[PDB]
Amino acid sequence: TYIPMSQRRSWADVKPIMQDDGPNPVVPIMYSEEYKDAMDYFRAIAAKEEKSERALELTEIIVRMNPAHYTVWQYRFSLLTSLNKSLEDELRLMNEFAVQNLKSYQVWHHRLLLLDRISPQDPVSEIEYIHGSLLPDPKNYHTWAYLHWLYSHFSTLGRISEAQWGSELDWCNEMLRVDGRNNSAWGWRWYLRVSRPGAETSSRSLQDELIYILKSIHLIPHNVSAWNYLRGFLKHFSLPLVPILPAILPYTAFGFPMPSDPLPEDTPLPVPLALEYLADSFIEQNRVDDAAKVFEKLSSEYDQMRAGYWEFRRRECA
Amino acid sequence: ATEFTPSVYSLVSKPLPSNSRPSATLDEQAETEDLISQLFDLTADPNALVSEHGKRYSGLRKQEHTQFLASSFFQLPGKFVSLDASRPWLVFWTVHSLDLLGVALDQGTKDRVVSTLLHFLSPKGGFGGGPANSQIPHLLPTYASVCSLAIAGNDSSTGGWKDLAAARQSIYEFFMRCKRPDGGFVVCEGGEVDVRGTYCLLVVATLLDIITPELLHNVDKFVSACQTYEGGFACASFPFPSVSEPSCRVSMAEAHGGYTSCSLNSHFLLTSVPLPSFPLSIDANAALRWTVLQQGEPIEGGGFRGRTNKLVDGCYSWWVGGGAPVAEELVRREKSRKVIPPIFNRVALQEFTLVAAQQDPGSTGGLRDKPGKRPDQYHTCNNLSGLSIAQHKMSHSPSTVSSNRLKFDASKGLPAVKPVAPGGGWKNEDERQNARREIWANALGWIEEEGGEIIVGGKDNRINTTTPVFNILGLRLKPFINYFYCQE
Ligand SMILES: CCCC[C@H]1CN(c2cccc(OC(F)(F)F)c2)C(=O)CN1Cc1cncn1Cc1ccc(F)cc1
Ligand SMILES: CC(C)=CCC/C(C)=C/CC/C(C)=C/COP(=O)(O)OP(=O)(O)O
Ligand SMILES: O=S(=O)(O)C[C@H](O)CNC1CCCCC1
Ligand SMILES: O=S(=O)(O)C[C@H](O)CNC1CCCCC1
Ligand SMILES: O=S(=O)(O)C[C@H](O)CNC1CCCCC1
Ligand SMILES: [Zn+2]
């Protein structure tokens, strides 16, 4: 049974301060007794700018009830730094919050601030934790953005070794093996292979990358993630579309991977993004009428949800 | 008007093919296809002259949705505590939805809205998610509070606009405290950095006449570098230093409808600003391509997904659908700079809203993510905002902007903001007044094109017209921004 804080000897010196939104506010929330009581005393604590262990305990009680309470998270981080608290202990507490399904922009940002301030010489154990944490939701947007930040921040400090980058690509390849439709993992591959400042750009790496892309398409011909990655790849490096057309043409009915001689089952043709590739390759050949004919078929037959967009592309050919 | 916007009921519905390669993504996609297609099969085609006997009628249940929103003006159950730091969003979702639905609040209730929000305003600058004695200011509640005051306030002594005007300098100082050298903003003291903050800040700074050069420096570069290889935009970009002038910027996650909306809208607001070589360009063609590729197939009802290989969801009607006119205008400017059918299926999006996103009839009302999900204030607001964009053909009109320039009175205005750094303001009055004229004239440049209306299911489904970029009615935007620029 609940003991109000006015009855606790540890809080007897503190006069709580009521929430002030006026006499008849709109969108009022029917707070539990526990939540109102804690915020009443938090208002008093924040008003007197008290930095103490009891204030720290109070912030944890509050964010457990409302993990999105950015003001209380802000106060909690200033408590940790003012008291010189163990930031590694706080990281373990955050691991529990994720386990108990306490999550928000605010918890993820709190974790970032901890890693920034700890500034480990090697962030490998945090990288591995993030990998494991993707098990209940392999597309968690906050988690993927945080992983990008972690590698970017600690690479600026010079603390990501070549072996670490190599095992990160190994892990990414396994994520896409388990689900080739995970667009978050495709985005991570782009960082690892293309956009990060330390990435290699050579004749071999471009060949390797195109092989991986084309193999992925031949495994899942209708996977939009692989088509977008292919188009982004060619555009980013200013590579022509025509030399690759042999691998794409079978979906529109050299040594780079080709489609299976019988295509896999459940692969109805044509693949609309294959047609888009063909049209754009026609445009690359200045064959605007051939491109316009392909756009017209996308508009009226093969991708009718986008009939207007493909008609717009058709008209541009004139 | 509908030759290139085929109805979902007129197209063959087929599942996303498997290529004989099962995965967790495809499991969820197929289950969602079953959910949505079954509800369409039970619902009469909204395009029929006589609604079919035995099937559900898809008409917009405006009175049910009004009653769903009404709890906002009484109280919310204790489970809403998860939104205790987002109460201005609860206001905005409610009062903008009521505007769209055509339902007026009486003056006493509007005054309560105004008074509640002014209790969230800190003297040192900005609105928080709740009372200023409880929560610190935050860029996102600041947008929601400012837009809500545009919807519910007025120019009298109790109307709240007078209070906002007096807060202009402090709000500006809050914005400059949030500013990072690379062009990002923290959303609050010690808070995260992403394009939601940039969007919310630029909307408010545009509306209140508090834009300066020091506020905007590098903001265009931060946003441009959020664009991904897919053509949409991520939450943020990372500045790598040389060893305010990074060697390069790299996007930090996937293209997402919410961040693509914020980035396109931010970039569009910056194109009004007369600074040299500003804003840094984006790839508008790729953003338009990404936008249209997110509209789902007939089997999933023609709603929008928020990112590649995820599920359709009614709230992306606003985030992705509402970005379409912005991307269109940027593409048009690029084409013009080098020297019409709808760009997304305006009919199918309405069908998703009417058939799949409304709560089942005779119930709580409200609109929702998908069948099987409880409705909430957020999906109610964003479903209806996207529905408005689909019903009304919106474009940014150069002749309207020109007419606005011709009527602008630069000798009227509130006091210039005082920059935090000595040389952080405009160079002189000629340049400041030219900036005010361009920013005001372009903010008021969106029009509904006559004869472009498409109301699926009949005129009783029509809702009011929202504005791209701001997401408030034009009849709210015009007197509000005119108040702060002293125009009439
Ligand atoms: C009534 C509950 C609403 C929950 C919803 C919105 N939501 C929010 C809460 C407070 C303010 C605000 O601001 C703004 F974005 F403008 F609406 C948003 C969240 O945190 C979570 N959401 C979950 C969701 C539902 N469908 C797609 N998502 C993903 C998502 C994620 C983040 C986001 F920010 C917007 C959407
Ligand atoms: C003005 C303002 C605050 C704009 C923000 C708009 C917005 C929708 C942002 C989305 C952010 C996000 C992390 C979505 C992923 O959530 P999810 O994984 O639950 O949903 P998903 O599967 O649809 O991607
Ligand atoms: O679905 S809505 O349009 O929002 C409102 C509901 O239909 C209410 N139906 C009433 C039944 C009895 C006669 C008066 C109407
Ligand atoms: O005078 S101002 O700085 O504008 C307004 C005061 O700072 C109030 N800030 C709150 C105090 C209690 C905790 C949450 C913030
Ligand atoms: O204005 S029109 O588009 O020609 C037709 C009307 O809007 C039809 N609205 C229905 C009338 C009967 C009750 C359910 C709604
Ligand atoms: Zn949603």
UniProtKB/TrEMBL annotation, chain A:
Its EC number is 2.5.1.58, 2.5.1.59. Keywords: Magnesium, Prenyltransferase, Repeat, Transferase. Its cofactor is Mg(2+). GO terms for cellular component: CAAX-protein geranylgeranyltransferase complex; protein farnesyltransferase complex. It is an enzyme of class 2 (transferase). GO terms for molecular function: CAAX-protein geranylgeranyltransferase activity; protein farnesyltransferase activity. It holds the Pfam family PPTA. Belongs to the protein prenyltransferase subunit alpha family. This is Protein farnesyltransferase/geranylgeranyltransferase type-1 subunit alpha. It comes from Cryptococcus neoformans (strain H99 / ATCC 208821 / CBS 10515 / FGSC 9487) (Cryptococcus neoformans var. grubii serotype A).
Automatic annotation (TrEMBL), chain B:
InterPro entries: FTB, PGGT1B-like, Prenyltrans, Terpenoid_cyclase/PrenylTrfase. Residues 60-431 form the Prenyltransferase alpha-alpha toroid domain. The keyword Metal-binding applies. It catalyses: L-cysteinyl-[protein] + (2E,6E)-farnesyl diphosphate = S-(2E,6E)-farnesyl-L-cysteinyl-[protein] + diphosphate. Pfam families: Prenyltrans. Coiled coil: none annotated. Its EC number is 2.5.1.58. One of its GO terms (biological process) is prenylation. Its cofactor is Zn(2+). The keyword Iron does not apply. Zn(2+) binds at residues 313, 315, 379. GO terms for cellular component: protein farnesyltransferase complex. GO terms for molecular function: protein farnesyltransferase activity; zinc ion binding. Belongs to the protein prenyltransferase subunit beta family. Catalyzes the transfer of a farnesyl moiety from farnesyl diphosphate to a cysteine at the fourth position from the C-terminus of several proteins. The beta subunit is responsible for peptide-binding. This is Protein farnesyltransferase subunit beta.
